[PDB]
Amino acid sequence: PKSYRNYSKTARNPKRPFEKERLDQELKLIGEYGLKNKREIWRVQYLLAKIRSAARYLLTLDEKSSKRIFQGEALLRRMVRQGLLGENEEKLDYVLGLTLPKLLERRLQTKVFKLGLAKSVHHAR
Amino acid sequence: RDGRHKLRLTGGKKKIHKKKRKYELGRPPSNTKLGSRQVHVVRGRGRNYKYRAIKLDSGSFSWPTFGISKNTRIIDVVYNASNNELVRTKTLVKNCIVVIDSHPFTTWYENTFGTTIGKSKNIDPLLLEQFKQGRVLACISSRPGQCGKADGYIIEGDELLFYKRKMDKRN
Amino acid sequence: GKGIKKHLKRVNAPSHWMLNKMGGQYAPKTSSGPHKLLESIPLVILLRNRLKYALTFDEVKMILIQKIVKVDNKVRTDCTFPVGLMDVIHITKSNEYFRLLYDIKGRFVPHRITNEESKYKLCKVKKILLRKGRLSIAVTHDGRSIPYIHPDVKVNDTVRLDLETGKVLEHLKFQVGSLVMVTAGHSVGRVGVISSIDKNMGTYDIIHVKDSRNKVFATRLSNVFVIGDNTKPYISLPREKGIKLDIIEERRNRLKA
RNA sequence: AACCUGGUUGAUCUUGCCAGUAGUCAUAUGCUUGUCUCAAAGAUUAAGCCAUGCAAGUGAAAGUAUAUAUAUAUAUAUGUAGAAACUGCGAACGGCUCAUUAAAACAGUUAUAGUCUACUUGACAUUUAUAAGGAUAACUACGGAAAAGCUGUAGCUAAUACUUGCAUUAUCCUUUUGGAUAAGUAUUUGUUAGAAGGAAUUAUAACAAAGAAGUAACACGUAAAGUGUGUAUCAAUCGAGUUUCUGACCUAUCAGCUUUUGAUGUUAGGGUAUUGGCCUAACAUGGCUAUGACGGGUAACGGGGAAUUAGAGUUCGAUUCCGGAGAGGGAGCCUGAGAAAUAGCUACCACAUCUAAGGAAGGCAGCAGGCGCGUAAAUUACCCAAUUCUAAAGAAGAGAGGUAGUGACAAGAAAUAACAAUGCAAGGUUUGUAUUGGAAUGGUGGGAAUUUAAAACCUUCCCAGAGUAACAAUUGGAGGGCAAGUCUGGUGCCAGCAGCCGCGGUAAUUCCAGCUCCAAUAGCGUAUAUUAAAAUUGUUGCAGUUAAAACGCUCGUAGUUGAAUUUCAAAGAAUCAUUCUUUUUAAAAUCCGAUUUUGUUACUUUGAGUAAAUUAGAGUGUUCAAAGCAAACAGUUAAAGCAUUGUGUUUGAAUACUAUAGCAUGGAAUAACAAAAUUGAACAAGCU
């Protein structure tokens, strides 16, 4: 009967819809990464919250515990492949500390603008 | 016809869904009288046949102190531990007490032992007197409503004394 | 009515069949036969999903119509035939011999075997029944009845069976040195040496089994299969050799390539 | 993301609620809507009523063919097929719905040493024979009835339909070998003996009685002897019926229920596939209950799960899977391995169809579709190509299922531009900003490749095809909460707005409009319900002098809670200065100076057994993502690997969770219980 393939939301509404400083920060990010909607930044911070929750749960676990010494390097290698952490990074505190612009730097439009090709981020989009 | 519609252990009434199933069944009883041998066939679960006897005259009967079974005929039914209506209407059931012909047993004793395996059992007088009469008391051991044949063993010793006292400080 | 069900939903199918969610609504319900549905695979999925010889159930039927594939050196044509825990599958057109076995991850794999080895199947006796005449029959995991077994054979032993003649060749006991393969637990697929046997009165008997790298795992007595003595397994094993690895260090050998 | 804000006042600090805020795989509805992917969908109310059509059939070696057609050497032998019909199997699966149901169903955990079990699989049998009997369909002829999946009579023929019925083996002894002896599968009865289980009235064996059903009077052809069909018993398997323990929402303005009418138990029987008050007869007076019985309510099918979660929790679960139940409501029954079956039958009730009026026929909570009900839900479409089931099993069917149609239920990605030069503003020749003016690209139309059962969609290619890129984005607001106007007209306590506080009586920042601005954005409002907010249900974690709230007081049972006390330390290696690892030290049984067990439970630690889907999570560039469970690698055209000339190779589909109850398991602490004196032992010797 019902289809067996799943689907999930990728964004979460902020709640407290009219914080002035939150709106200003969102507009700054939107304008300086040239993205069409704040739904997109909501997706980015939803993903960021996912990674952060995984990281803090792992940090709660004691060192050399099996769950930590499996999932920690799983997550760490995923972040390294994504380019979110550098070589000087080795621990989970840094993946806890990575931020929204650091996540946004990896979008295609930002990368192509940085490499050239398009002279504006909106041109890249 | 089995399982439900009763009261709970606490005395409460249980609501009834799940209308009656076939595997609960509950066939009507067979009031097996004694008469010309006639049995019917009941097709139980799995096409297994059950022989429902309605009338029997004869059957296998065992002298257990010798462990020898001979076919004889049932003359009467005289006692049954359950409802007293069963003996009055002369129905054969599993634990019924019957009177059977003892001539095959006496003839077998004469033929093998002589006179009137683990032989030389010395018999007993209470059963000897019954043999001399010619009719002997026996207890059914099969289920005529299930196997389709009445069959049992001669009672002797303390159980014979018990049943004789119960049938006839007495009336 | 409420007779026997004759359909299997895909998600209700056994997990080790590895059938995909979206690949239809039903799974092939294995026909009744030598092995339980849970501890066997139908040869339709054996040579459609594992060997990839057939792409559809109709192609499985196409293979089966010609009396090519033989299960225990005899021709099988039922599409949903339970192949079972361990036995030989001979495909004559391609001239290949398989033994059905368990990987360390608890899944059924056809392991390549030689023609010489394809005549030596192993059967785990499950019951010893004496019938009329004091004649003894061993009932094995294969659902097979072997009359006139050697009186030394016990209820948890195993016997090497010749497929051509259907006769026992030798038997294997269950001492603390007999190597076994676990069949249905968390440790399905592991091969060990049996460290100890604990026999609880009236409940499941547990056995602790020592691995090659000296790691011990416990299991229920009914879920083991004696394979050999301490010297060597009497059958060949898949490439993992029944050696399970910790997941944290399977990753390292996956990465090094 | 472990959050708060407006409102009682002249002002203040509280309690306290109202209101705001966000989510909802949560429903409806309003406005709006250019793409693609993904896909819920007559559950809520009416398990209400249904026109029509379809939804279970089946013959490729293998039961029965002079209906009939055909082809080879020549009326001969082979055949190939084959309508109908008999026979066999299936139709007890699937699909739908959630009415009933409150220890019932279900779930985890057992038992069946208390049972049944078709197909399939392995074993393997006992008390005229160169091949036995009638009797029937199809068919033929005569018919009846308005009508039906109605059928009478007469005549023949088959069968794997129905029914009869035809070696031999084993054992004792002199001792390869000679004579001798015996002959029932299940099932039932009586008397006995007795490879396993945890425990046997077990397997099995002997004796004495019965005794089914069978052991082929059947059909086609594989190695350069086979198969099909059928058959007794055992075993396996697909299952099923009962069954152990434990687990459920609200209600005491339900406190005593059950027991003639079986309630609880014993005995004997009947019945069943089997156990059982399941039923019967006799007997006894039991059984449950404030740890909530018995009742009532549920807008209650249960669970896997879902929403919301910092942690606890609260709410939901008709609905993919599993289990249960039902086919308008009841009841009864046939066949069958399996049904108390409903696209099977019988009857009653309620509906309801045809009728020539005599009689027939029905069950959409199957797929579409219609009426009704409603706030509330799609096509009387295509196909068996995939998944899988049934068959006489390749070849036929399947409204199962798949495909498309409707579809702003939800979910994911993502257009409505981007860029160069002056004028203007800001700044030491840097940013923003109306003009031009060329690129770029979808949306769209057409052809094609492709896809597909066919078609459509996606993708890809080729033609056209954007300047007011008219290829024109909306929804709701602008006093505070809460982002955004003391801007301009109209109205003037009216109209109206306003979730709350409030605005409106001529200057209305709040109504009706325009402009501008704000918010979210192909989406945005509204209503209802629910979660967080709510530490305003508080176990974590509330409050009770005065805000609501200590019984008037004491006794007191259930419940909850309960002082201390019984085996303590020393010594030795390794990180950094400490931390960490190891041995013994009373008594009783074990091993000839040493070899090894020493209450029960809770609790706690480890395991075992854990269906998937969902969840967490490992891997994997579906162009990303939602996803899925795949995939990856050399190859303008062949090296290498291995095989003794060819064969692609490497893989992955993990792990975790799966109660609180049950099984096993290490345990020193903390808790109980046990044992412990108006006395109770142990040892030695003698005695029975």
Place this chain on the structure above:
RNA sequence: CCGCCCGUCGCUCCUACCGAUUGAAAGAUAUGAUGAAUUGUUUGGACAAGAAAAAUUUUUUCUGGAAAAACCGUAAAUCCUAUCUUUUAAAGGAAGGAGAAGUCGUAACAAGGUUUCCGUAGGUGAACCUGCGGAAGGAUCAU
């Protein structure tokens, strides 16, 4: 304090309650009565086939057997009665809430002009008054 504020009585609207009417309706149980269909058993007995004889026909017997009938049982359905549940009509009665500048008084808040309040009892147009015993939340923390 020209503050605030209480109650009766008038008028309107809304909600709920009591209510004679042996009120009404729909359900659900239980007993009783009748009782379709049907398992089983028995009684049956249309005939359909056998065994005997005469050289087209007859008797007897064996099974097998359809209508039909009876009796236990399973038991639909209908009716009576009783009880319970839900909904509901109603003369009249008596509340609560809301509304409007209505009428009468001044109960409380100041020692509110008789301090207030509690329990109880009686009385009065209404707020209320009075008796008895209490409390300070009193207008007294005090020879």
Place this chain on the structure above:
RNA sequence: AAUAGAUCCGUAACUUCGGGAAAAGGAUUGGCUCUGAGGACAUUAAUGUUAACUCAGAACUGAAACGGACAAGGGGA
């Protein structure tokens, strides 16, 4: 006129808690053949002799009738 005896079942409002009450309202009843229960008395745990009608249950039976005549409440609001 309607039952009306007896046994079994069931019994409301109201109430001064005693009643109402035989409330209301149901079922059964003959004959025959049986079954079961209820006592007293003596011998060295056990065996015999003997008596009332009183209940309960079951078959069978009949023109479905049985407190067969007699006798004998009508109830309810």
